[PDB]
Subunit: 60 residues, 2 copies
């Protein structure tokens, strides 16, 4: 079970909407599990100079 999603623990494939948490942990998340819209997601992933952090890393 290779890149486990941080929220749901199931594997993240390339043909799923996935984001890396560059804020710290370096875990991937299914976009769906994080609750983030396709509209936020596609834009984040189109701006290279933008980077994201998960709910847990932004909490500390």
């Amino acid at each position: 079970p290779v890149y486990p999603c941080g929220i749901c623990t199931n594997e993240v494939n390339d043909d799923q909407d996935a984001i890396l948490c560059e804020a710290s942990c370096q875990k991937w998340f299914h976009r769906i599990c994080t609750g983030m819209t396709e509209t936020a997601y596609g834009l984040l992933t189109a701006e290279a100079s933008a980077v994201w952090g998960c709910d847990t890393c932004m909490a500390d």
Copy 2:
């Protein structure tokens, strides 16, 4: 008290779209100077999970 835009050296004021580099240095940049679009700008300021880094910090 002056905030020079890390690209153009001119002050960043309140009536101007601006963005802080939290990857690293922590200078303010006018949105216009970065060549960042308004939609990316709205996402980045809206979403607290999304942080921005300038070309110099992202570069190295």
